[PDB]
Design a binder for these strands. Structure first.
Lengths: 203, 135, 77, 80, 83
RNA sequence: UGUACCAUUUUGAAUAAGUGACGACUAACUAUGUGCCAGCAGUCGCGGUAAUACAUAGGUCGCAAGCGUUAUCCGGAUUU
RNA sequence: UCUGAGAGUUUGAUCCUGGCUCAGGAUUAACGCUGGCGGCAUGCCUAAUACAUGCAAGUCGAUCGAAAGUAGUAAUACUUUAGAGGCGAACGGGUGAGUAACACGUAUCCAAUCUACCUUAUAAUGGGGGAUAACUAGUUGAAAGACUAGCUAAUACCGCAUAAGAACUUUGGUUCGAAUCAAAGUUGAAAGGACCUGCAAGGGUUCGUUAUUUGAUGAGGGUGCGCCAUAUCAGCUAGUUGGUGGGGUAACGGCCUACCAAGGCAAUGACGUGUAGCUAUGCUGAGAAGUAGAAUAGCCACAAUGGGACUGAGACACGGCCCAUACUCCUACGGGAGGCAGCAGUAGGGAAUUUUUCACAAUGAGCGAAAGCUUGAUGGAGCAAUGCCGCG
């Protein structure tokens, strides 16, 4: 999946709350482990470096809602620039158009954010994106098109916008500026991209 | 090209065992007479030594052969080579603006010219009855 | 197929006839020089070679080399 | 032009009497897009003079780009 | 000759041909994998211009040129004689 | 090329899902038939007195308009 | 240092020796399943086999006589040249059969080599004579073709004038297999068509040619360096090996020959053998190295195989010619014919390898003062998730 259709499952099983109390939430049933008839501490050797590298990769590319092919495309594009794979890769992944639109507080869910930005109502670099594939940079102004300034769901989301020490959003005008990269301290606490760094052996 | 009035199609409106394809080849050679290639002495005469008529029906079958004859364009089409069926004779009839009905005198007992005539008589298309078995 | 290929075929076959004639005349002048070896025939060969080099069929190097070989025989006499 | 459609990239090269574009060239004239009216070509009023004085005039579509540099205004009297 | 410097120096071996010498050149190249210098032997046909004759059993300097005879595409240039 | 880009230009959750396998190597497995038969399988190797590796229902993860498969060079084998 | 994965395989158990496997990018892909678009780029490795079909460089009168007719009584304003003659025809593209090498990468010897237009410009377009096609007539002819007879123009064929410069004889000078200059012998450049002014001359004006001459252009032979396999291939090689003379492609070169000769390569394995098109470019890994040089840019090779000649500056010429060999159509069995290893596309093997592709719009050449034309080169497009890319 580059998508979902029951996100609460992914949030609970990955061990990371994609929404803190809106995806690992008491909405009836609520879980924090692997669900089903196979909830089990597998005595078979299912745990190694490979396993946790995979698990962290799952968490990171399922909180974004983005496809893995664009994950590898971002890795390759950053490979054109010398630096550190871990921090640069995670910062570029955070700088995803849909991820940043959600970070603005413009959509209740990453899937909904992706659907909205694809719908042709997000202006970036004076280009209304018909496909949310434009990776932001520090200071990239995302604008909400004239259509999505009258949409009730994203109106309520935007009016409840989220500000962080590395972005800011003007919710009344439905606009957002990606202030800076989350360098090493504004990243999620239970998420580590270094595993994806060590996931390769062909560097 | 030749005038619109002079675009007339003609399908061989008969069946084999009647000297049909012999007459079709005769008409094709008569209206397709060209001498710069030497064809005049290459298909001069056509006649049977008939012990097989399938060869006559097949090898001479003209699916669509167009020529010109001084006043008009003659579209000779010998699609039918079967004794009794409807597809080839019917497409020939649909194409032709006029029909030639190849009948017999030596073998007047040919059974499958009634249905061919009835098919041609549906659209009232002009028909010329021609008999070649008189030898 | 290119019509200009056959056009240059016509032109080059006529050039074939003309150049056969002219090169045969030059070679018979060279033969006459090599038979009666003298400066006058050397000058005739020089004039013929200059004419052929001016025509622009074969480069002047062949004319110069053939006349140098002729005048070498001249110096041998 | 060449490359990707609706994003053409014209690579201008040299020729004597037979050779194609961007194949065998005496010297790469430079890069101009047919959709771009200004060239980043290797044109400095010197290579053009080299190509003219050495014979084998290059492709006949950057003549205006050489005209803007005044190449002809000196060459047509240098030859004279 | 205006001919410029090119390396063809070697030990001339024989002059059994009329004013033509066979020269043995020992050229050292490098092993591509194990990285050790190894020598190889080559033969060259140097043309003796008639005014110079390659004295055999010695080192001679050959220099490149257009062919002089069949499989004779070099001319002898310099010689170091016996001592 | 009436292409490209623009403007919910209009109604609408609507317009698109498949693959591997879950014992390890190397993430994904609980039950049902099955007596080394059925069938699985790249290595270990799986089934002969109750099957989570087989076959299936299913849940599961890796993905995805591509999914798995073999193909092909080196390194993971300093295991030339 | 950018950088580097492990586990599983044996004896009751332990280890060791050694080996195999998955664990990675990546597709001319294909393949199951199904399928969103477009962008984007890919697209016979095998078959270099024939190539059917269109197509793969056309432009020329400002070179010419007339053909040929629109308006005109005609002359002629006018259309191009069938034909003579000009350039490009070798461009382009293709595959790599074969080619393992100066082809290549690199500096060069070129003392031996030209290059048409072009280019550094000095010299020229003086003057003709007569043809020849076009045109006309006859002939063989089913056509294919085909011979004979004449006429005429030019930028057409063939001499001379001038002709710096220059080719090239004899002497001096100078010079690292010749550079350089003085004296001096011989000797040769055609061709003019067209437009305005001017009686004309002349001036302006555009083509076509002329020598001389700085280079490019394509390439020539050699060239140190490296350039596949080949010992379960050890001897191979009679221009072999080199010399004088003569001839020779553009030229040095036994390039080739008369004459004179017996030597040349080689256990660091000679010769032979078959193959790969070589460099840049194509991936994997840190690295060692391996993996193709398919197609491609350069070069190189065939362009149905093997010759010959001509042209062109460069060809012994894919789409010129003649021929032998493979083939073929029609036919009255007399006869004539050509090549996609050009584009596609066809036939096949394969898993499959694109249009039986559009305009020269932009870009190349070629040529025309110029209008411009063609390119199956190019630029597009189709085409198959064909591969990547993003999307829901």
């Amino acid at each position: 999946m580059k998508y979902t259709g029951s996100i609460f499952k992914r949030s609970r099983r990955l061990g990371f709350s994609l929404l803190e109390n809106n995806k690992e939430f008491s909405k009836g049933k609520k879980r924090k482990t692997i669900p089903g008839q196979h909830g089990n501490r597998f005595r078979s050797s299912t745990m190694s470096g490979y396993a946790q590298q995979l698990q962290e990769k799952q968490r990171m590319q399922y909180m974004y809602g983005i496809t893995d092919k664009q994950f590898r495309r971002l890795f390759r594009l950053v490979l054109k620039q010398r630096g550190n794979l871990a921090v640069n890769l995670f910062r570029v992944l955070e700088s995803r158009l849909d991820n940043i639109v959600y970070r603005m507080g413009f959509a209740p869910t990453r899937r909904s954010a992706r659907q909205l930005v694809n719908h042709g109502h997000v202006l970036l670099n004076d280009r209304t994106v018909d496909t949310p594939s434009i990776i932001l940079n520090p200071g990239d102004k995302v604008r909400l098109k004239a259509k999505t300034i009258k949409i009730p769901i994203v109106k309520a989301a935007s009016e409840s916008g989220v500000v962080s020490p590395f972005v800011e959003t003007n919710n009344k005008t439905f606009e957002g500026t990606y202030v800076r990269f989350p360098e090493r301290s504004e990243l999620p606490a239970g998420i580590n991209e270094s595993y994806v760094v060590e996931w390769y052996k062909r560097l | 090209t030749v005038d619109l009035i002079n675009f007339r199609n003609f399908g061989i409106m008969a069946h084999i065992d009647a000297g049909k394809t012999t007459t079709s080849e005769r008409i094709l050679f008569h209206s397709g007479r060209i001498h710069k290639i030497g064809e005049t002495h290459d298909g001069e005469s056509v006649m049977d030594w008939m012990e097989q008529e399938k060869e006559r029906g097949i090898t001479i079958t003209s699916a669509a052969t167009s020529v010109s004859w001084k006043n008009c364009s003659l579209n000779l089409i010998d699609t039918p080579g079967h004794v009794d069926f409807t597809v080839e004779v019917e497409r020939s009839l649909r194409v032709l603006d006029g029909a030639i009905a190849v009948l017999d005198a030596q073998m007047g007992v040919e059974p499958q010219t009634e249905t061919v005539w009835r098919q041609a008589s549906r659209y009232e298309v002009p028909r010329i009855i021609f008999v070649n078995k008189m030898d | 197929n290119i019509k200009s290929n056959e056009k240059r075929l016509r032109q080059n076959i006529k050039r074939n006839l003309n150049n056969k004639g002219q090169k045969t005349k030059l070679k018979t002048n060279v033969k006459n020089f090599h038979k009666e070896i003298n400066l006058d025939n050397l000058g005739n060969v020089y004039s013929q070679a200059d004419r052929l080099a001016r025509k622009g069929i074969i480069s002047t190097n062949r004319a110069r080399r053939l006349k140098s070989r002729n005048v070498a025989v001249l110096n041998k006499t | 032009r060449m490359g990707r459609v609706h994003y053409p990239t014209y690579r201008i090269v040299a020729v004597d009497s037979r050779v194609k574009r961007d194949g065998k060239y005496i010297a790469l004239i430079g890069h101009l897009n047919p959709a771009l009216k200004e060239n980043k070509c290797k044109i400095d009023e010197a290579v053009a003079l080299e190509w003219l004085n050495k014979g084998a005039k290059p492709t006949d579509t950057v003549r205006s780009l050489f005209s803007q540099t005044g190449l002809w205004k000196k060459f047509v009297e240098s030859k004279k | 000759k205006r001919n410029q410097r090119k390396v063809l120096i070697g030990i001339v071996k024989s002059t059994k041909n009329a004013k033509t010498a066979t020269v043995q050149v020992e050229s050292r190249f490098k092993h591509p994998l194990y990285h050790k210098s190894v020598v190889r032997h080559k033969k060259y046909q140097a043309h003796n211009e008639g005014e110079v004759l390659a004295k055999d059993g010695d080192k001679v300097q050959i220099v490149e040129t257009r062919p002089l005879s069949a499989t004779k595409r070099f001319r002898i240039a310099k010689i170091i004689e016996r001592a």
